[PDB]
Amino acid sequence: LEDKSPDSPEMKDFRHGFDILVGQIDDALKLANEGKVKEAQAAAEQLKT
Amino acid sequence: SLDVPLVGKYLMFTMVLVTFSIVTSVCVLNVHHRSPTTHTMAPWVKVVFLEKLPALLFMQSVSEDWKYVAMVIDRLFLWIFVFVCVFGTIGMF
Numbered sequence: 001l002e003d004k005s006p007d008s009p010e011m012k013d014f015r016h017g018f019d020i021l022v023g024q025i026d027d028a029l030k031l032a033n034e035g036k037v038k039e040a041q042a043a044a045e046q047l048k049t
Numbered sequence: 050s051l052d053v054p055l056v057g058k059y060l061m062f063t064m065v066l067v068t069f070s071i072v073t074s075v076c077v078l079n080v081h082h083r084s085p086t087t088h089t090m091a092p093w094v095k096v097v098f099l100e101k102l103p104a105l106l107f108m109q110s111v112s113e114d115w116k117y118v119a120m121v122i123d124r125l126f127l128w129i130f131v132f133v134c135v136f137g138t139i140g141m142f
Contacts, residue, residue, distance in 0.1 A: 002085050003111060 021047070055141075062137065066130065073126055081119035085111040094118065101125075 004010045028043035090111065098118045102108070105128075107121060 059137070059141075066133065070130070073123070077119055077123045080122065081116060083115045088115070090114070098122070 001010050001014075024043060024047055027046070028040060031039040031042065098121060102121050105121070105125065107124065
């Protein structure tokens with residue numbers, strides 16, 4: 001998607017998805033601050049989805 | 050086969066010019082259907098195909114900008130088949 005402008009909702013729905021992927025690491029690092037391994041592995045299978 | 054009739058020479062030469070037209074029509078149809086995600090558009094193409102056309106007496110988005118190249122290549126070919134088609138009747142005289 002090149003000549004469609006970066007403020008278009010073609011580009012924005014791409015940019016709507018990319019705050020979730022930090023937050024699923026922030027779902028993963030939320031349980032990781034205890035260091036519980038299987039709850040750090042609870043969101044480790046989530047990030048492929 | 051000691052002599053060839055005159056209608057057969059003229060029909061065989063216009064068959065040769067029609068198969069040259071189908072090869073240049075396939076090249077014009079491939080140049081028309083390009084797109085910026087698949088193709089490159091070098092500067093040489095811009096400064097030789099958006100600058101030539103006042104030698105044609107032809108006067109004035111990348112997906113329009115490929116489509117104006119494909120207007121101007123076959124309209125160059127319209128002059129150089131009409132100059133052969135008038136020559137092919139003064140090959141009779």
